[PDB]
Design a protein around this ligand. Structure first.
Ligand SMILES: *[C@@H]1O[C@H](CO)[C@@H](O[C@@H]2O[C@H](CO)[C@@H](O[C@@H]3O[C@H](CO)[C@@H](O)[C@H](O)[C@@H]3O)[C@H](O)[C@H]2NC(C)=O)[C@H](O)[C@H]1NC(C)=O
Ligand SMILES: *[C@@H]1O[C@H](CO)[C@@H](O[C@@H]2O[C@H](CO)[C@@H](O)[C@H](O)[C@H]2NC(C)=O)[C@H](O)[C@H]1NC(C)=O
Ligand SMILES: *[C@@H]1O[C@H](CO)[C@@H](O[C@@H]2O[C@H](CO)[C@@H](O)[C@H](O)[C@H]2NC(C)=O)[C@H](O)[C@H]1NC(C)=O
Ligand SMILES: *[C@@H]1O[C@H](CO)[C@@H](O[C@@H]2O[C@H](CO)[C@@H](O)[C@H](O)[C@H]2NC(C)=O)[C@H](O)[C@H]1NC(C)=O
Ligand SMILES: *[C@@H]1O[C@H](CO)[C@@H](O[C@@H]2O[C@H](CO)[C@@H](O)[C@H](O)[C@H]2NC(C)=O)[C@H](O)[C@H]1NC(C)=O
Ligand SMILES: *[C@@H]1O[C@H](CO)[C@@H](O)[C@H](O)[C@H]1NC(C)=O
Ligand SMILES: *[C@H]1O[C@H](CO)[C@H](O)[C@H](O)[C@H]1NC(C)=O
Ligand SMILES: [Ca+2]
Ligand SMILES: [Ca+2]
Ligand SMILES: [Ca+2]
Ligand SMILES: [Ca+2]
Ligand SMILES: [Ca+2]
Lengths: 387, 5, 234, 6
């Protein structure tokens, strides 16, 4: 062998010098760094009742070491092994993580099927999602067919579309026109452009249909109200009016267990508000570190409300009560002026009025960022059409 | 644009 | 001259080096990202996924500072993962270009071989990976003659290994160096630069001042050792 | 960009 210490003489790390084997923790620094007097020395051998380790044991030249099986970790003082709480790291398991003694159990909603790995699940349907965005002149729908994005216009007579939402029961796409002051509806195939609201709207920010109760909710910035109406627009009433300054966002959870609504207000003292539909159980859930809140979306399997910010430039989520607030994209220059938000499986899609782009990223950590499309005008609304 | 000073 | 990273760079305006961990940082204006790697360029990674039109870059402590031409500000982020991204300045009236740190503590120091007799080079030397590397001035046509230690005019008259090249282009035989006889005329073959590392033929005699003479030049017709050591100690 | 869409 080339010049080193190939014999049993204990070589110091990185040096061409080796020392006697008796040097180990004998009281005098013998290696240039004193590796013989290692920081991990004077630990009893494993003959000392397994060295106190709760699992498999090692008694190498540097005192002793306790090792743990997969899914376990060492304690601070290396006394005992400790379990990893795999559900305490967000995004580890897509839905419904359960912690075991040394492992984890996962399950997904009846609309999802678990994959080979017991963490990720995908939609059970055979139909790919559609991404619909609202450019000023036209509505642009993206055929999401295995990353083979295909832009095409949905409707032609649009002049200024701001809000977007869809009804899965009838397969229609709803949008509001700012210049016309009307709310429309059409089939996903671009046929049957029929009006639903023809008057009484000034600046409709977002539209959220109630697909269980067949209702239609929307926020009007000029009127400073949250309004509800039948899905065909027959019977309109004002739902929320007390302290509603500049309502922008709106999300719904029509499942009977929840039956809850959320909206965002960016007036003085901006906040995210939670209330049961019909507006009885009204409360504020997010009022800290908020400035110009914009856009809302709900992770239905996990019951998390995703929200965005245009002044602080972040994307966050929290529980229905506002607790467990977490950041997915924060302190990142990628956000300039995000407006609207949309979720699907494990991806999050948002429209940026600054960069004039609609983007994508991991809805748990904000990585895997990519660009969906470039828009000539500011993209205002966005929604994902999928059962 | 231009990668000047 | 070899390339370190060469796959996907477009507009690498900024470059910085961290002596504390021996990692290399750089910034791209078009890709709009700041990347780190080892000095060999193996463990390539992205530190900041969006940095706009960055021009300058500098790492001090735990943060990397870079100026942005598009948004005329100075930013910073954690050197390992790009966290804690904040803007040091407001939007400056003009585009900031170039950035550096003023550090009072002396940086890493190593013994310069050029500090000893100019490292044996003739005009300009710099410390290389193994030793001092000689170099020639920017004006004139030169070539690294005489064991790459001597810069001589490039007239094309390359001369034999059995000869010692002078600054005048004259190649006396290689045995004539450092014998305190100005065989070059201008004393180039007798300068202290070469005599500090030259040595005396085994069939010759070594002078105290570093010169070399054949044995029949000791205690002989005339003194030619330079310090009277040939005539002394016969 | 100002936040007011109008
Ligand atoms: C665009 O999509 C819409 C909605 O699918 C199409 O309109 C109508 O959709 C229904 C869906 O059931 C088609 O099926 C018909 O349903 C009735 C339900 O009672 C049934 O009685 C009929 O025998 C039939 O199965 C219906 O044919 C269709 N209407 C028309 C005009 O064909 C619309 O056709 C689609 N347009 C394009 C561009 O294909
Ligand atoms: C847009 O997406 C739709 C829905 O997935 C695609 O429609 C199906 O595509 C498959 C594969 O080409 C066909 O075998 C089916 O017959 C299609 N069904 C219908 C209802 O058309 C469509 O192909 C996609 N188009 C593009 C441009 O990717
Ligand atoms: C609408 O706004 C007013 C003003 O913020 C609210 O009145 C405050 O309510 C809190 C209790 O949540 C009191 O502690 C404050 O003293 C009240 N301030 C004032 C100036 O009255 C009011 O509760 C809000 N009403 C609704 C329907 O939400
Ligand atoms: C972006 O997506 C890629 C996969 O397309 C992720 O790559 C994984 O990165 C982790 C952390 O480095 C590795 O442990 C995995 O082995 C990688 N898997 C694959 C398939 O490449 C990546 O994590 C995503 N973005 C991030 C957060 O880096
Ligand atoms: C980019 O860099 C790599 C080296 O890291 C180049 O690869 C070398 O290319 C030369 C021929 O030009 C070969 O003789 C070497 O053997 C290659 N080295 C290795 C390790 O593969 C590569 O050619 C460079 N590409 C460009 C565009 O310059
Ligand atoms: C372990 O030690 C570190 C450093 O002292 C401390 O910050 C951390 O909170 C400790 N963790 C536990 C679980 O004790
Ligand atoms: C003197 O000896 C050294 C060491 O052996 C080198 O070989 C040097 O090149 C010698 N000097 C001459 C005559 O070139
Ligand atoms: Ca010792
Ligand atoms: Ca576990
Ligand atoms: Ca902003
Ligand atoms: Ca001479
Ligand atoms: Ca003599």
């Amino acid at each position: 062998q080339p010049f080193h210490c190939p014999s049993t003489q204990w070589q110091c790390p990185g040096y061409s010098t080796c020392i006697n084997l008796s040097a180990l923790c004998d009281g005098v620094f013998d290696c240039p760094n004193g590796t013989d007097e290692s920081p991990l020395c004077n630990q009893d051998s494993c003959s000392h009742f397994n060295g106190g380790c709760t699992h498999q044991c090692m008694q190498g030249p540097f005192g002793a070491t306790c090792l743990c099986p997969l899914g376990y970790q060492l304690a601070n003082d290396t006394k005992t092994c400790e379990d990893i709480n795999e559900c305490d790291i967000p995004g580890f398991c897509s839905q419904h993580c359960v912690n075991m003694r040394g492992s984890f159990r996962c399950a997904c909603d009846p609309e999802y099927t678990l994959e080979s790995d017991g963490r990720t699940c995908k939609v059970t349907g055979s139909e790919n999602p559609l991404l619909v965005v609202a450019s000023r002149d036209k509505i642009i729908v993206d055929n999401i067919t295995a990353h083979t994005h295909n832009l095409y216009s949905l409707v032609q007579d649009v002049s200024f579309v701001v809000a977007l939402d869809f009804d899965s029961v009838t397969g229609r796409v709803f949008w509001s026109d700012l210049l016309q002051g009307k709310t429309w509806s059409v089939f996903q195939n671009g046929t049957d452009k029929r009006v639903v609201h023809d008057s009484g709207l000034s600046v409709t920010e977002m539209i959220a249909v109630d697909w269980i109760g067949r209702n239609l909710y929307w926020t009007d910035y000029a009127l400073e109200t949250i309004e509800v109406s039948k899905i065909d627009g027959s019977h309109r009433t004002v739902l929320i009016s007390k302290n509603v300054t500049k309502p922008r966002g709106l999300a719904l959870d029509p499942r009977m267990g929840d039956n809850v609504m959320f909206w965002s207000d960016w007036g003085h003292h901006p906040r995210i508000e939670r209330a049961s539909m019909d507006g009885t159980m009204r409360t504020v859930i997010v009022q800290e570190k908020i400035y110009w809140p914009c856009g809302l979306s709900i992770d239905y399997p996990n019951r998390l409300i995703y929200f965005m910010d245009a002044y602080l430039d972040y994307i966050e989520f929290c529980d229905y009560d506002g607790h467990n607030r977490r950041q997915v994209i924060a302190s990142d220059l990628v956000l300039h002026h995000p407006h609207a938000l949309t979720l699907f499986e494990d991806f999050v899609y948002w429209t940026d009025r600054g960069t004039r782009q609609v983007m994508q990223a991991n809805k748990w950590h904000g990585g895997n960022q990519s660009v969906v499309m470039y828009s000539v005008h500011q993209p205002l609304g966005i929604t994902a059409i999928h059962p | 644009x231009x990668n000047x000073x | 001259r070899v390339p370190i990273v060469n796959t996907s760079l477009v507009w690498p305006n900024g470059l910085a080096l961290d002596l504390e961990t021996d990692l290399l940082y750089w910034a791209d204006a078009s890709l709009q990202k700041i990347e780190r790697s080892t000095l060999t360029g193996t463990n390539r990674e992205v530190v900041v996924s969006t940095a706009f039109h960055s021009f300058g870059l500098t790492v001090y402590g735990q943060y990397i500072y870079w100026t942005d031409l598009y948004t005329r500000k100075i930013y910073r982020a954690n050197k390992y993962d790009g966290s804690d991204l904040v803007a040091m300045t407001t939007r400056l009236p003009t585009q900031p270009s170039g950035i550096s740190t003023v550090v009072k503590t002396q940086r890493q120091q190593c013994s310069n071989p050029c500090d000893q007799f100019n490292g044996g080079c003739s005009h300009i030397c710099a410390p290389g990976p193994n030793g001092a590397e000689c170099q020639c001035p920017h004006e004139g046509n030169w070539y690294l003659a005489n064991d790459n230690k001597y810069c001589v005019v490039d007239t094309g008259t390359r001369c034999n290994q059995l000869q010692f090249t002078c600054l005048n282009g004259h190649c006396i035989n290689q045995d004539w160096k450092c014998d305190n006889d100005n065989d070059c005329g201008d004393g180039s073959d007798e300068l202290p630069t070469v005599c500090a590392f030259h040595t005396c033929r085994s069939t010759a005699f070594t002078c105290g001042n570093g010169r070399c003479v054949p044995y029949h030049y000791r205690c002989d017709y005339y003194n030619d050792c330079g310090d009277n050591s040939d005539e002394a100690g016969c | 960009x100002x936040l007011x869409x109008x």
